[PDB]
Each structure stands twice: as structure tokens, then as C-alpha cells.
From a paper:
Subsequently, the TxDE(D175A) mutant, which is catalytically active, was crystallized. Its structure was determined in substrate-free form at 1.6 Å and in a binary complex with the substrate toxoflavin at 2.0 Å resolution, by molecular replacement with the refined structure of TxDE(F94S) as a search model. The structural features described in the present study are based on the structural analysis of TxDE(D175A). TxDE encodes 221 residues, but a total of 222 residues from Thr-2 to the extraneous leucine and glutamine at the C-terminus form 14 β-strands and three α-helices in the substrate-free form. The metal binding site is embedded in the hydrophobic cavity in the B-domain, which was generated by a deep, concave, funnel-like surface enclosed by the hydrophobic residues. Although the top and bottom of the funnel are mostly closed off, there is a vent on the side of the funnel that connects the surface of the molecule to the inside of the enzyme. The metal binding site is located at the end of the 9 Å-long hydrophobic channel from the vent. In the metal binding site, three residues from the inner wall of the funnel (His-60 from β5, Glu-113 from β8, and Glu-138 from β9) as well as three well-ordered water molecules coordinate with the bound metal. These six ligands form a coordination shell of octahedral geometry, with an average distance of 2.2 Å to the bound metal. In this coordination shell, His-60 and Glu-138 form part of the equatorial plane with two water molecules, each across from His-60 and Glu-138, respectively, while Glu-113 and a water molecule trans to Glu-113 serve as the axial ligand.
Numbering used by the authors: 2 to 223
Write the structure that this text describes.
Amino acid sequence: ASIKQLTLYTAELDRMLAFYTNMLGAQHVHEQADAFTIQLGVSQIQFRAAADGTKPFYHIAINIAANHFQEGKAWLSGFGELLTENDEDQAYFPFFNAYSCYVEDPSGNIIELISRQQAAPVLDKPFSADQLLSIGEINITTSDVEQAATRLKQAELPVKLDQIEPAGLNFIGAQDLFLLLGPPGRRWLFSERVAVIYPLQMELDNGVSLAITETGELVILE
Ligand SMILES: [Mn+2]
């Protein structure tokens, strides 16, 4: 499956709108009162105003073509200093056979471009914002990992309950989309920030809709 719509919160609505408009172009953004949406290929993200006293952020990876990694990395570096880990400004993940690069947006969201070497198409054309393919990862940071995994299995997602680690990160998915299911607490790779529970809502290709409440419970909406 793929993510049709992801709803996230932000305490920096105005700066976020300016950042994404400059990055993707007005044609890929739609401003509303107290919220705006951005189009990322077949996926859309709607950023809504956060509650005062909160500064939500998330880890979002965006799929790009198998052959577009260096162009993607160059393009991303135009919007912010590339984040680094172990002093390197990119990573290779053998589990996903993918190359990744990162930048922070105005809210501190960890924005990753992930180029899956065998699980993404080869696009014989120049890379551009119009070549972002879909959302490839989103963190599902929950107060109950076991309960959450059990419910995602119903949402029809591939889940091997016997391998679910309640105190760690769990890669739930296949092909080009993986939900990063885990508890709050640990520092995210490439970031100074640690995983913390913030609300979000997600609508999948299969008509399944879910939400993470402000206390971290994963709930199937439809
Ligand atoms: Mn990632």
C-alpha cells in the first residue's frame, strides 16, 4: 500500500508554508486557514496548526527514483544544510538497499529523501521537485507498540507479531513504504531530537484510516 494522505501538526505554520512553497513550488502547495497541504507524488501531507505549548515534529522519508540519489541530495542541500551522522552527509541502509540524505524543516521535522536501489523505478529524466514519488517512511511513535502492531495487522499491513519488539523500532511494511513503529525516547538518526509522541492521522491507498492520539494510542478511524 501507499500513503494517500498524512496529517501532521506544526507550531511553525507560516515559516513551514514559506519553506515548502520555495521548495516544491506553488503548484504543489495549497494554503488554507490554519493548515496547508503539499503534494509529494502520489502522497499528500497536510500540516495543521499545533496546540500552543507543543512543538511537534516527525521523521518523514520521501521516495525518489533509484537513479536520482545524487541529484536529490544536491537539490535537498539547497534548502538547508544536509544533516550528518558519523560525520557523513548520506547513509546507505543495507536492509532497504537504499541511499538516504536529510535536512531539517522549520519545525525540526527530519526530512529524508530515500532512493531504494532495487525497490524504486529508474527514471531516465532530470530530477526535480516534480519527481518526488511518494512517502516512503513515517514514524508511528506509540504508547503501546504491541497493541499498535496488532491493529496495523488488521489494517492489512504486513506484521509478524512474533518479531515485534515493544522496546524498539519495528519496520512495518514492504516494497517502498515502511511505517517505523516504536516507543518514544530514543534519538533519531541524523538528528538531535528524540522520539516523542505527537498526534497524526494517516489515510492509506486501501481505504484504511488511522490516527495516533496525543497520548500515543494507534486507533483505526475507518
Ligand atoms: Mn529514515
